Design an enzyme around this catalytic site. Structure first.
Site, PDB file in Angstrom:
ATOM      1  CG  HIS A 188       1.342   1.677  46.693  1.00 16.73           C
ATOM      2  ND1 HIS A 188       1.390   2.134  45.651  1.00 16.73           N
ATOM      3  CD2 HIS A 188       1.968   2.745  47.313  1.00 16.73           C
ATOM      4  CE1 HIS A 188       1.926   3.661  45.529  1.00 16.73           C
ATOM      5  NE2 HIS A 188       1.597   3.580  46.674  1.00 16.73           N
ATOM      6  CE1 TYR A 206       4.557  -3.266  37.047  1.00 14.24           C
ATOM      7  CE2 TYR A 206       3.067  -2.279  38.475  1.00 14.24           C
ATOM      8  CZ  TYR A 206       3.896  -2.624  38.350  1.00 14.24           C
ATOM      9  OH  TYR A 206       5.017  -2.733  39.229  1.00 14.24           O
ATOM     10  CE1 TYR A 213       2.840  -5.557  41.322  1.00 14.62           C
ATOM     11  CE2 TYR A 213       2.658  -5.137  43.107  1.00 14.62           C
ATOM     12  CZ  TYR A 213       3.088  -4.725  41.860  1.00 14.62           C
ATOM     13  OH  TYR A 213       4.257  -3.205  41.838  1.00 14.62           O
ATOM     14  CE  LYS A 221       7.610 -10.336  43.548  1.00 16.85           C
ATOM     15  NZ  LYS A 221       6.166  -8.665  43.706  1.00 16.85           N
ATOM     16  N   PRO A 279      13.173  -6.990  35.672  1.00 16.87           N
ATOM     17  CG  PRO A 279      14.062  -4.363  35.129  1.00 16.87           C
ATOM     18  CD  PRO A 279      13.946  -5.862  35.133  1.00 16.87           C
TER      19      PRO A 279
END
Ligand SMILES: Nc1ncnc2c1ncn2[C@@H]1O[C@H](COP(=O)(O)OP(=O)(O)OC[C@H]2O[C@@H](O)[C@H](O)[C@@H]2O)[C@@H](O)[C@H]1O
Ligand SMILES: Nc1ncnc2c1ncn2[C@@H]1O[C@H](COP(=O)(O)OP(=O)(O)OC[C@H]2O[C@@H](O)[C@H](O)[C@@H]2O)[C@@H](O)[C@H]1O
EC number: 1.14.13.2
Lengths: 391, 391
Positions: free
Chosen positions: A72, A201, A385, A297, A293
């Site tokens: 990704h 998201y 991220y 991480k 969540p």
């Protein structure tokens, strides 16, 4: 029995440390309360940063991963109105993340182990840690109704949140930092084509929505819900409408629904322990810290924890530098907090908080519109991220 | 009397709009409640971004500023332990900020005006705004005990926080966003050499401390204090020890103290109004929004407001595009919130908040250590600190 490093927990963390060490010629022993399929049944995790990847590669556990996990180069934030994307690959100055289930990882370490013939005491009940600050600590446990003893030099406290490890540390010696969020995440697993070749998201009036994946034909979906919700109440149907009620218009019309394999609610918690050691006890992964969540991480922190604990066990083992183990918790803690801060930040901006006045609501929005709008802003989501460097 | 644009308030905002327009050949009239020295006595502001600078240049009010204000290529954040600096000049991709008192600016516009012979009704009492949505609005006010009338096409609502402007807008038509902080800032003015050739913002256990300046021989200093504090209680002495008690060791020993010229406490408020218009009334500066003095954004927002209002009054005036004035509040509001978000962020991380549990404290610290540590992180303080582009 006697061994070198006796590990508690046959989960990701435990099985990782376990493998890694076996390869380094440090004999280890895994003690697990439940059976291997029970453990195999947990869905959890889906995104691993590069570090956890390479680690995987390093325990020689990457055959499958290299073959089935997906790479990704982006993510999406859909906040009330539009849909912005983050080029992690470009803004991180080349990095990425991999989508490859916790379950798969677990099955993969479990295969490696069995194969190398490393010990693993499954269904080991009443585990107990002894003589923690001595020259020779021990673990007592029960096999049937037989209570045995495993002599070791060190103990790897890898039994997760509700594990016995942390508890074995004199309460007075430990200091706790915990935040508990007024909401949960309802996760439905569907054997259907995922809505996107990337993650989405979604911050929406009605709450957060998450669109994730497992395969070209396996999708994972989430909706934020009050702690008071009961899955018994969330039928496939309800979920499907609530999801669509939460996504970008052009997403929802592209959405392929279907019966759910698994449905469960996870409550968001923020938790940290300092220090992560006690005598000859070193707690890692869930047993030392928890993360909501949201910044994905959680399993990434264990890897960072284990990568650390391992490399220090090596020095003491082949190089006799028993001394460095003291720095275990100084090392881990730097990473943890920056990881705790990122997921806090994540969480606060994408979630529907009850009892927020208009300023704070205006400020939530400004965060999104500030950060997904400025390149320096962008660069911050990106360096985090994908994961901050290891040290 | 009759004029084109009647302005209420003879403060920064008002005097700026006032000047700017006079030059553009749009006759204006300033109405002020207090006398010119009263207004001249307010200390306030000290840092102006480039935009406010150029604006100054544009009203032909920059002779003095170009000569006495100082150019700053950096700032300092001293958080419990160390002292990190921000290269605004490099991270902003060339920008800076100027240190030149609110007072000085005020004296400078006041000089320009008087000189051009623009009208300014000082000590004008009982100001009142009339026929706000009509084809011809008006202002009524009193000179002595004589109530006069000033016919205009538009009204510039520049009377600050406690001004009459905003009030003149039908409450039901306006929506308010306000945050009020549980602390204040105690500001002492000293005719002494400032501790640094740059600004030092200090986050310390005991609260925030600020080291600022006016000249090579004029310093400005601050300490965060409970809303319950009374300056009567803060003697020079107390302040001097409390400051030193709050700064970096090597700073405090370099510190030259002395008697204070002025001492005052300002309470931190966060406030926004949407929309900033009503009929032929356009509110700007303090009367539309307030910002905690932390990101030194307050006087910088007025400039952004006035730069806007002016350029729209021009079009309607010389180009007859009366229509664009409707977009006044859509323009201003984009800037405002990003400015409101930055100062909120600023504030939250450098201040001592009562009743903060350990997580949040750990998180405060992580913010500082995350943001002053990563270049992308750094770049965010920088693009904002110097000021986001105007539109
Ligand atoms: N008293 C005990 N004795 C032996 N084993 C135990 C005991 N208590 C718990 N365990 C076992 O240890 C394992 C702990 O597993 P996890 O919580 O998944 O552990 P960890 O490797 O720390 O974390 C994995 C992932 O899950 C997330 O919660 C976490 O953030 C990370 O992403 C489980 O198999 C559990 O049965
Ligand atoms: N009813 C009234 N009629 C006429 N004038 C008035 C009235 N009420 C107030 N005024 C006058 O208008 C002026 C408002 O001044 P400021 O608050 O300084 O105005 P502004 O130009 O909006 O702001 C300047 C700076 O101060 C900070 O609070 C603000 O963030 C900015 O940095 C004062 O001189 C005040 O006497």
């Amino acid at each position: 029995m006697k061994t070198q490093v006796a590990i508690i927990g046959a989960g990701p963390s435990g099985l990782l440390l376990g493998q890694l060490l076996h390869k380094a010629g440090i004999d280890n022993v895994i003690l697990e309360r439940q059976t291997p399929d029970y453990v195999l049944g947990r869905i959890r995790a889906g995104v691993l940063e590069q570090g956890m990847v390479d680690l995987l590669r390093e325990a020689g556990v990457d055959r499958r991963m290299a073959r089935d996990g997906l790479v990704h180069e982006g993510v999406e934030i859909a906040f009330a109105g539009q849909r912005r994307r983050i080029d992690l690959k470009r803004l991180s100055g080349g990095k990425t993340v991999t989508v490859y289930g916790q379950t798969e990882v677990t099955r993969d370490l479990m295969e490696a182990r069995e194969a190398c013939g490393a010990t693993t005491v499954y269904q080991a009940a009443e585990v107990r840690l002894h003589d923690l600050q001595g020259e020779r600590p021990y673990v007592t446990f029960e096999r049937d109704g037989e209570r045995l003893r495993l002599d070791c030099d060190y103990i790897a406290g890898c039994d997760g949140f509700h594990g016995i490890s942390r508890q074995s540390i004199p309460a007075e010696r430990l200091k706790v930092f915990e935040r508990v969020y007024p909401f949960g995440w309802l996760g439905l697993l569907a054997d259907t084509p995922p809505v996107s070749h990337e993650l989405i998201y979604a911050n929406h009036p009605r709450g957060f929505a998450l669109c994730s994946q497992r395969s070209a034909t396996r999708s994972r979906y989430y909706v934020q819900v009050p702690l008071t919700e009961k899955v018994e109440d969330w039928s496939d149907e309800r979920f499907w409408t609530e999801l669509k009620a939460r996504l970008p218009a052009e997403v929802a019309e592209k959405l392929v629904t279907g019966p759910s394999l698994e449905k469960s609610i996870a409550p968001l918690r923020s938790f940290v322990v300092e220090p992560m050691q006690h005598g000859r006890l070193f707690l890692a992964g869930d047993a030392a810290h928890i993360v909501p969540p949201t910044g994905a991480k959680g399993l990434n922190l264990a890897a960072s924890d284990v990568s650390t604990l391992y490399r220090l066990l090596l020095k003491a083992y082949r190089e006799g530098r028993g001394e460095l183990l003291e720095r275990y918790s100084a090392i881990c803690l730097r990473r943890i907090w920056k990881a705790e801060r990122f997921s806090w930040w994540m969480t606060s901006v994408l979630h529907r908080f009850p009892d927020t006045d208009a300023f704070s609501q205006r400020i939530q929005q400004t965060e999104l519109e500030y950060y997904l709008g400025s390149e320096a802003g962008l660069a911050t989501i990106a360096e985090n991220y994908v994961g901050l460097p290891y040290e």
